[PDB]
Structures are given as structure tokens and as C-alpha cells.
Design a protein around this ligand. Sequence first.
Ligand SMILES: CCCCCCCCCC(=O)N[C@H]1CCOC1=O
Ligand SMILES: CCCCCCCCCC(=O)N[C@H]1CCOC1=O
Lengths: 184, 179
Amino acid sequence: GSHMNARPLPAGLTASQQWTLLEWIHMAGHIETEGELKAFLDNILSQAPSDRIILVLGRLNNQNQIQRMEKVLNVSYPSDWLNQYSQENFAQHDPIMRIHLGQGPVIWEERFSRAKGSEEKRFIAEASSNGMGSGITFSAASDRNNVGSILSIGGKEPGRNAALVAMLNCLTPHLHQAAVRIAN
Amino acid sequence: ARPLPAGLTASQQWTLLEWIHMAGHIETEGELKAFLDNILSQAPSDRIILVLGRLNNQNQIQRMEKVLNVSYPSDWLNQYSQENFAQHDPIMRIHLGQGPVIWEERFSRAKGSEEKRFIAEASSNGMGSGITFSAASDRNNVGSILSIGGKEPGRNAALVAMLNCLTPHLHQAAVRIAN
Ligand SMILES: CCCCCCCCCC(=O)N[C@H]1CCOC1=O
Ligand SMILES: CCCCCCCCCC(=O)N[C@H]1CCOC1=O
């Protein structure tokens, strides 16, 4: 069952990290509103003016890719970047929108380097000029409804912190269930 | 959100984290039942049920939406349902979201003659002692109780604190299954 197939918890966390992860997952399971989700992510993840954090709940295709955004839960992507992303249909050129939700974390660099299209390259240049040339995306999908969420965090630093990556990866299914409560 | 329990050992904390993590992945009724039975029947002849209900304005169950039996006796559930015991059961009067309620303590404080009649009947059916955990959500519109009948309710302080902490997550799972 889905409870048994829950992604495995991290091995080798410090006592401090284990306690933090327990706090995070316990708290996430109480989030009922957009306001609470944003405050929670601000509280546990926000670090600096240069932060780039967003959570997106989407309707999925047969490869667990987001076909339609159901709910966008912004924390620190620039307001006008989202406008531009909508206005210029970036979802069609953004390599991160092609991820198969429910796989492990995806470092942007690995997808950005494999760009072939001039237009994909243009999007990546534009993203870079907005502080989003590097980053990491965590994901989770429900088993019994075709919805899933991605948690994106900009910058090189998060992906190089092994403990944080493992912790955020385990938190992500809980953020997804929160997003589903918020969207309902 | 209720606070994490203080004073757990590292292995107890890890156990609780595993349970909350697993609970947050439950999407089906079969999954919730299997989860409760496999982890909570840590016991022998302890009797376990989860009930999801709509709440009145004092956080009491006013309508049962989902009964999720684990190990309440078939016969007791038959009797309870057939004789409308929910009316007279002091455990059904809990303000959902409060800390654990030990049945003995609640039973001794019951004044109504109907209440006292129910208690005697529960006792002769092996349902005389137990503990009930609870949680409420959605602006206190709905809530669940996790009830465990058995020998000495709150003996194992760490386990009681762990189950209290887990309960809101079991409630959210029940809500997912019932909606
Ligand atoms: C109108 C709502 C737009 C919401 C856009 C959500 C995009 C999620 C995937 C993501 O993190 N892509 C990064 C990669 C570089 O630049 C981005 O933006
Ligand atoms: C429609 C009947 C099914 C609902 C039965 C659920 C009862 C939940 C409250 C509870 O745990 N009360 C204990 C107290 C003594 O004996 C019980 O049973």
C-alpha cells in the first residue's frame, strides 16, 4: 500500500537533523491554508533576499508530468517572473516542467546542460538573469489521483547539502498532501 | 499543531517519525486499517477503533461519518449500534483535540443514569478500561477519535505521548479516505 511505499527516511542524520525533520513533517500535516503553507515554507526554508522558492500542484499525464497547474504556491519567485512565465508560455520551454514527479530530486544543472533548443536555451538565459540558473526540484505524486507537486529551490547551495536534500525530499510528499488540502 | 512530545529517546523519536511519515501517505481505507492493525496491535487483546465525525460547536461528534474498526469485538459493535449507545457513552462527549482521555477517569465523573448503565454494560463486555486520543480540523468542523480498549490505558507514558502526537495525522488520513 501507499503507506508502505513511502520514500525511505534518511540514514545518518544528526540528532538535531532528526528532530528538525520530525518537526517539519509533523507541522506540514497540519497545514490547511495557502497562508499557512507560505508561512511554513518561509519559516523553515527562507534564508536570504536571493532565495527562489515555489511549490506547484499539478494535474499529471501518463508519465507523471505536470500537464496543467492546479495551484501555484509562491514563496519567493519574483512576482513579475511569474507574469512573464505565463505571458511567454515558458512551461513549454522550461526543462524542469518535464520532470517525472515522484522520482528523486532533480538538480537543474543536469537538465539545463542537456538543452538543445535555441528556445530552451533562451529560457535558461532568462531564468539565469532572474537568479534561477541553478537549483533543485523535489517532487511527489498521489497514487490514487493523478496529481502531484513540485518544490523548487533556486541556487547551488541547497543541492550540495546532502542532509538538507534528504530531509526536503522526505518532507515533499507531505507538502504535496498539504497543497491538495489547500486546493480542495 | 500539538507540540512534539518531550523526553522521548532517539529511537522513540525515530519510531514516531516513521509512523507520521507513513500515515501521511495513506490514501485508502485498506491502507489505514492495515496501518492501525500492524502498528497499534503492538498489544494482545487490546481493542482498537477510529471514528471520523462531524462536530458540534463544542467539538463533540454529532454525526459519525466513518467508522474504521480494527479490533473492537464484532458483538460489542453490533450491540452498540443496535442499542444506540453513542447517546450514553461518555467517550462520545469528548471535546475532540484535547489530550488523551483515560476512560476510568471520565467514567467516574459521569452523573446521568443512562451513562452509568452504559458503563456497566461496557465493563461486562471487556470495554471497561481504555484511552481515547483525538484531533479536529477544518475550523473544528470535523474530527476523529482513536480509541484503544485494554488492561491499563496510560501505563506506557512514551507510547501514549507518541500516539497522541500521531493522532492528527490519522485524522487527516481518515478525511482523505472519506471525502
Ligand atoms: C504563472 C505561474 C508560473 C509558475 C512557474 C513554476 C515553475 C516551476 C518549475 C521551476 O521551478 N522552473 C524554474 C527553472 C528555472 O526557472 C524556473 O522558473
Ligand atoms: C455505531 C456504533 C459504532 C461506534 C462505536 C465507537 C465508539 C467510540 C467511543 C469509544 O471508544 N467508546 C468506548 C467506551 C467503552 O466502550 C466503548 O466502546
